[PDB]
Amino acid sequence: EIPVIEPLFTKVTEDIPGAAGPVFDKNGDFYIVAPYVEVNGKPAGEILRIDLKTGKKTVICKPEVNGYGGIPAGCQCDRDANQLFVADMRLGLLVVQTDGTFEEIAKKDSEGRRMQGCAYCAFDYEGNLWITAPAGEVAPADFTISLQEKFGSIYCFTTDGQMIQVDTAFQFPAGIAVRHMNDGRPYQLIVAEQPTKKLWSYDIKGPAKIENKKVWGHIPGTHKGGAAGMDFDEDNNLLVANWGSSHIEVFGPDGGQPKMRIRCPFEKPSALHFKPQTKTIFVTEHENNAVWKFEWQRNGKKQYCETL
């Protein structure tokens, strides 16, 4: 029977529709996304900065392109500039500055196909950005999601600036993470397929080059939902938000079944992110549309933005 731990969670902020995309930038500022904010009945999602002492929210960016609003859904911080890479389910991959200005990175992929809306992303230590795209085509196409049909895709945005579609036919691909060798070389890509309760892995052979696709892990529960956001601790244990299960699952480095579970005081953890150089994990959740923090057993895996 999988051991369960029940640490103290502390509320950080609240009232954030669809709270997701927790991230720290290079200065230690903390951000989240509010994907489901609407204006005049249409998408108008937001990227927010959170004051960690008071919980006060500041809107950083409310992305819109040619009158189509964004659904910002997951974030990573860059290394060479203090800017956020934001997966947006209507706009694709955005690069967002702290001053609120932003750019849509690609409208088409390297084969000339229209981009799909993106949900989660993860930098490898070489600076390539691996991205899940569970939505259909970006705005101006009508919004669709691969909850029941297998049209979700996987991308790699390389350091050379190519947006390469590396796989497709996923049923709602969600969290994504890069397992690195001890020497820093990218080794495995892990991809959550949310409703099928599967974690998939590939061997990374280079930028946008994956092979050896296999089922890597299994997500407990039969609840509606499944694996959402995920990230590694510094021992390459993979912590996975199991949306609808009231738990974060903990996988050892070689996957399989969870070796431990973390019980949350809410049903719908959506994403998690470590505060750099600490054991503190920030967790977004959709039961209360709020953000919490708790102490894990060890520090998080160093993010690309902390490397030199």
- Structure-block tokens of residue 170: 């996923």
* Candidates 180, 247, 273, 286; catalytic one: 286
Please choose, from the candidates 153, 10, 6, the residue with its C-alpha nearest in 3D space to the C-alpha of residue 93. 153
Distance CA 293, CA 274 (A): 9
Elucidation technique: X-ray
286 is an active site residue? yes
Q: Domain spans of the chain?
A: 9-225
Q: Does domain 9-225 have CATH number 2.120.10.30?
A: yes
CA distance 109 to 116: 9
